[PDB]
Symmetry: C2
């Protein structure tokens, strides 16, 4: 089952796609879209999480807007990260509050909420950023190929374990930037594992983009990601 949510809470508009497991009362994963916005591929990822026993909320951070080309997509992303960052923070916070009020993410085995977050591209940046901002709320973070140069990621504040996925030939994220993030995690004692796949580009997980998709590593990284989310959230 997947449903479109749209409602107001604490003065902000929450919208996105919620995939729910069959019967399983599982953990929750927040899934953050790329710079194109909340498109079908992201909803598909949410469905895939639900088939593994997780509630998955593909939150819309673009207020219903999507882009099909880099120029418009870059404008939406720069607006989100550079002008509406406070608002996006408030949407994340209100979403978390909403799910907890509805018992979504409550895990019987531990008698507590277990909430993860993952995202791709700008959604990877957001995973890091929000994971630091809301460090009491998340039990696992899985940022895929986010930029570290767009917004200040406060590595000192992160409390969750992190699975950080990167592409070896990423045209947007130099390896030097990945190295700097590793050194910050070393410095602050962040339990971050960095996975760097040789020879693939940015967005290699996106099966709808044949110019960058890599099947071998997309299958590999999905296996690793589900294992990691299960380890920390169930």
């Amino acid at each position: 089952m997947g449903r479109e949510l749209k409602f107001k809470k604490d003065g902000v508009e929450i919208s996105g796609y919620l995939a729910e497991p069959e019967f399983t009362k599982g953990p929750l994963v927040i899934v953050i879209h790329e710079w194109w916005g909340l498109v079908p591929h992201i909803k598909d990822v949410c469905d895939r999480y639900a088939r593994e026993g997780f509630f998955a909320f593909g939150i819309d951070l673009y207020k219903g807007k999507t882009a099909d080309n880099p120029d418009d997509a870059g404008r939406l992303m720069q607006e989100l990260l550079g002008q509406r960052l406070s608002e996006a923070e408030a949407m994340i916070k209100a979403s978390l509050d909403y799910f907890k009020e509805n018992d979504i993410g409550f895990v019987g085995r531990v008698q507590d909420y277990r909430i993860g977050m993952t995202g791709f591209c700008c959604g990877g940046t957001c995973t890091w950023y929000f994971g630091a901002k809301f460090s009491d709320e998340f039990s696992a973070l899985a940022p895929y190929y986010g930029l570290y140069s767009l917004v200040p990621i406060d590595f000192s504040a992160i409390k969750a374990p992190v699975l950080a996925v990167h592409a070896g030939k990423d045209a947007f994220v130099p390896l030097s930037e990945v190295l700097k993030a590793i050194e910050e995690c070393n410095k602050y004692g962040v339990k971050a594992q960095f996975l760097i796949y040789s020879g693939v580009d940015h967005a290699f997980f996106n099966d709808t983009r044949p110019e960058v998709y890599n099947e071998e590593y997309a299958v590999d990284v999905w296996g690793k990601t589900v294992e990691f989310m299960k380890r920390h959230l169930t």
Copy 2:
């Protein structure tokens, strides 16, 4: 319940420890020791592989010698990787030939041999080096925290997928060296995934060395390694 193999083949003396799975006839993994030599910890690793369905051969590359301190260990390692590298190569090749003659590592599903190789510290270096030297013989490589600057690894020759495990605070392997390896893999089309664990030291997998062992990441990396070896060897 493994066996100590000792025999001569093609002019070189082979010795090591062979762990065998029960109730399953599976792939082979060659396991290469650290600079201490073929000590109980390494035999334990072989046993662990056998419990997951693999034959595992902990080859001795030190001609029966072990070391309990860094000075003696460093001398044995420098001798292995300098003066006796050709001999070690011949031991690896003769081992492979021996197993194939005895049907060890033959996998029914693919009607062919599937042989992996893994190792730690100097054994990680060896896994890279021999994986390139004997490029057609290996179907998976899992080098843990080896140095890249001791012997010339021929990245251009590697044909197997690689799971390269590194420690984020490795006192012996700077992250700049890991980056150089990633760039070589990118350049030559090696299917290498690099996994860098923040905050841990060299030899963090070694549960017999409490000063560097890290349980959380040793458990994590074991899971990842078994999944990878199963994916490529069964």
